[PDB]
């Protein structure tokens, strides 16, 4: 498991998330068809950055091309970059230090990786952060330690053996239906207890291939 | 007057503090919190705050809660006018009464008159039992206004709680339904009546939960983790959509370049014909900034529908997904794509179609389920559309499936093909078996015929020679060609014959 | 010139004498015989008699048959202009080629320009394999014209033989599909490919025969014993239908009297609420001369759709059938009635609705099948209609089902009710169990409250006091009230708001 | 089985069928919206009356209000009646003789009962009759010796006993579902061999109730 | 693929190098050169580059030239959308065949649908004699489009060679 950010790494990640959110909001406010001129509105300077269950109360101040991010404890960190949405890597300076941060798409946020640490970054207003705090933490269910075959077809290849350790996202078998292969992947972590289906067999819907 | 502010504060309490606390302990926001999250800060104007029901049956005259279980009004989302109503579950379980439905009817009439989107937030129980047929009449008025607004203003329904009985039919006639996982459900008949009639024991989640309506029943267009995520995604979706059927798609400043080439697309199509590929990767490499709002992502996954942006303007996308069922067309995918295409055409949203389809799904299950009419639905939607249509064939386009997937014969404006495209009636083997049925009892002659047919016809060049394909393009120029084509096609002017409406199969 | 007559006689032979004899040995008429039987004597004018294909692949240049497998033209049915095309099964199996589809496109364009009905007679194989993608392009052109003519002129498809592959999508987009039993079938994918892929063995009849498409798949609107009966019923249906969406319903001199009373209807409703009755009897005692052309009679038999005449003018009828599934609304009945109502509204045919419905069909099978959207289809069709709507409640109208069945709240013009009508949210027992849930443990109190609720609300008078029902009428005056109401409502003028089209769920 | 008409009964039935067909065609030809004037057209006098597998070549000539029907052998049977469509009984004079014929309409024809004889009557033109002769005589497949339950529900009553012979169109059992009864009727002929269910039994679809 | 680029280069040659050289020796530009000079740089998108005729009379099946004697497409002139077609004199003398007229009809329909000007560049011979009444039918379809577009979009004809017959 990738460690959560802490200290200066967390501060830099929060500043970068705030800068990306500010850029996206500035672009968003320029949409056409608004009821009145968007210039007649105001941007809420106070922001909350949540880095995987870690809050940062920050203020974003546009100062020229670069962005100025001020944290609660007096510390300020100017942010300067030419990054544009869709670019997989955020490159620029936070404070007075060059940094390269991986940016991945996320629902209402961004997934950030930097200096060996990874975190999901979401930027809210204070009221939005308060409302988001009311949402519960939901736990996933999982799979019943069996690789059910999602479609009928003929088994082409099995790249696992009984008593072998597999992680999540690892391919397990290939099933070909109507002249098209389908790579089945493990949805959990564990060891394969036994293999039921064999290469050349024709399976059906909800058929046991292997047990975890 | 301090008394007016006191009355406003009393009206804001809904049922009571205990009901609101129970709502929060369920993990759900209140109706007013949902409205506040959806709208721009300080933009909400509320209608009918002090409206009370007038029922005197079964002791209802002793329970008069202002608002009657729904909060209505209007505001702005990213500066654009939107109307909305949010049912208050704390007030009689959000049930719909005469005054409740009257408030909803007022907000619907205002939304239609002003040509602005209307958002429905559903956390309720249906018609209020104590009011009798008056609640049914109000529901009918709401249904009539939903039908009147269809195709004129975008209608979005957000299911954030129970939705049972006649309540479900209002979202069903809207353009998009979104559900919150583990806390929302929809069904016409509740679990108790199901148990009493069919002797089947089912929970509310198993009967109408988010997973059922996002992956099985084709009802919901998407699901989200919680209320906050759902509402933020609603705000995101509203930025894609036109305000009405006249103003056109909204425009933003794009950070992407319409002239960039994508060399990685030249190796996307595998050499092995049996090897699939992810069409979602192509879609996300074509749209601006890799930003794609997928519609019905969990349902009929052999096809893909959703909204992207090209050069800062909303574009609808339809694409066969080879990763699921080899990308064949079945009834579910046909209906999903047909509804999406109908919505895009109704609101002047251009459609880009990526085609890799070997045909339709065979079997008695498809034929008994009405695959003929269901596929005809997508064919009808494509042939009816007057918005710009740009079609790109990547690998395969066989027979009737090729015809249906926005071919030039049904009214596509520009039809491109990659060098790996295969536009033919059917596969080489079957075509040889049919054409040379008299000599089917060979082994070398059959192979020679199959190879000759593959060389002659399993290519994009027979269609290109007939003019069915405008140009065979390099895969790395797909985004540039699409952007230039859409820019040219923005001025397209076409009209269907004069009619009250079409008779598309249902 | 004798040579011209000789060439005409040679073109009339189609495939050959042996193939025509084989066609007759199956009990099937030839395409020209079917055209002759359909049209008035001596009225047929044939287009493109000498058209032949231009294919030079796979030795097709040595087989040039005049007409290219389809007979097209126009005639009169009972003196009214109709266009038609009849595919010739003896010529390349009726398969559709470039010239074949061009002839069909010509007749479709003529039918649309002249605003006259077009009849398709299908006995074919699909796209001609030897011609490649040109056949697909022609099929696409035919599909585009089918979509363009939808809702403008009535389109009738008669399946009198095989209909496979891309051929089936043209009838699927027409208004009515009729099949001949034991000799016609329709499927997207044939039995051989089904066996190859899904490993199941099915005959053509088991996969797409008349029974399957008339009782299971919702595809066909009816089936007939043989070709002659089917064609005569097609002539009858054409006598029922308007020529286009402008001229209105045809009128004939009625032998019936609009002021006659039917005393037998006063005893139609059984005293026992659990005992059903035949709603078809009521329909056939209301229409002129007991003449009723039922549509989709074998499918979703809990509802009834069809055409009758009142005072010599075509009237559409929709009615719940208590004999089947207690008259509840399910997905199949909802879709059937919705399509029928949409057709009637598109062509200015007034609709009379007889309502006896206890609610919707419960269960996981209905909810997983999308009952919400399927019922919304019928609700949408009723709320969208601008033709006259006359509704009569016979026994029961509960809740959302009452709302959907052309209630006044969704735009019905006149709503009558028999004295036995019961308009309520739900049954008395469930209503009491919900309203008085706190005291369900006292049996005598529960019975007393159920009796009180039954007396107060299980009647038409609560709706009548709210104005939801225009008048409670005697059952024996139903036909007189309907005829007078339709005569008054003939001048109805209303319109939906301006749009490209609606976004009705699919 | 009701006997088919013979001799003068068959002639009277054919004359009545021809008169009804003539009246219906005359009314039909008055439909609105025709391309040209309906009067500028001719009616084919020669008709063929198919009477339950029996052909009569007749000519219909309107002698004023009444109708004159002439058969092949030269005999003429004038037809005079005030019958209107929808009336269950045809009453009038056929060849100076009052008659009463039950009229039950069917597809493209009428079912007629008179003097103890019943027949299906269809009136074609000569070309239409020739085309109809090409149609095959299809035989019904019948039903099996098992009475399956078409809908799930509770059996409320059985009106047949063990070893009891029943005919077609006769009630067999009552099944109640969703507070509505459903009367099941025999679709064939055969003595009951065994009864599998009784009152109070809950049955699913395609469940055996009684065996023939 | 290099094969696609090779096929494009072969289609760009029209009749042959000798025909193009003879065209240049008369002081005339080629059809593609005329299109390039008319449109803004890099704005030309070509339709139906690989379209070929389907005639089998008088040995025409042995002469299948991509484009069938006309180059069609769209571009911009000073940034404004225009549609155009240039008849290629090197291909059968620029004569109009069924596929040739079909390409012209496609570009005319696109121009009318998009409400943009259409430019016709004529260097041709008329109806192709080997393609019988089909050539005449194609000419008639082009005429019908010309009449339908009259007074709706500006139509400009440039005669840069022979223009005879229909
Ligand atoms: C919508 C529904 C699934 C909500 O799930 P639920 O929370 O488990 O059911 P609840 O009883 O707790 O509903 C909350 C309150 O709203 C009320 N309510 C719910 N639906 C109502 C309706 N249509 N009319 C009037 N009141 C209604 C309930 O009586 C309840 O009142 P209470 O808190 O004082 O006891 C369910 O209430 C429902 O189906 N209502 C429709 C009417 C009905 O059939 N009720 C019986 C089925 S449980
Ligand atoms: C439509 C269909 C069900 C007809 O049933 P059938 O009578 O049992 O099949 P037939 O072979 O006898 O068809 C009759 C003729 O029309 C031809 N034909 C049928 N469909 C055709 C098509 N789409 N293109 C070209 N020819 C076709 C057949 O080759 C056959 O020729 P033949 O008499 O010289 O042998 C079946 O032919 C069909 O599905 N055709 C579509 C193409 C196909 O897939 N054929 C193989 C499946 S059998
Ligand atoms: C249009 C025209 C004035 C061109 O002038 P030209 O250069 O002196 O005539 P050319 O013979 O050299 O035409 C060039 C080629 O295009 C061909 N061509 C020209 N018009 C054609 C047509 N309508 N159909 C088919 N081919 C045609 C010519 O056959 C010639 O072929 P070639 O080079 O292999 O010998 C003349 O060719 C013409 O009128 N064509 C119409 C058909 C006709 O009547 N031809 C005979 C009159 S010369
Ligand atoms: C070989 O395995 C079968 C190839 C032909 C059937 C396939 S299945 C999916 C495509 N759809 C169709 O109708 N035929 C194709
Ligand atoms: C008692 O047996 C159950 C009565 C309530 C259920 C019935 S089934 C058909 C009707 N539809 C519905 O939702 N309820 C009614």
Numbering used by the authors:
A (entry chain J), D (entry chain G): 455 to 666
B (entry chain B), C (entry chain A): 5 to 510
E (entry chain F): 5 to 170
Authors' own words:
Glycolyl-CoA carboxylase (GCC) is a new-to-nature enzyme that catalyzes the key reaction in the tartronyl-CoA (TaCo) pathway, a synthetic photorespiration bypass that was recently designed to improve photosynthetic CO2 fixation. GCC was created from propionyl-CoA carboxylase (PCC) through five mutations. The enzyme forms an α6β6 dodecameric complex, where the β-subunits arrange in a central core of two trimeric layers, while the α-subunits sit on top of the core and face outward. The biotin cofactor that is essential to catalysis is covalently linked to a lysine residue in the BCCP domain of the α-subunit and acts as a flexible arm that transfers the carboxyl group derived from HCO3– between the active sites of the α- and β-subunits.
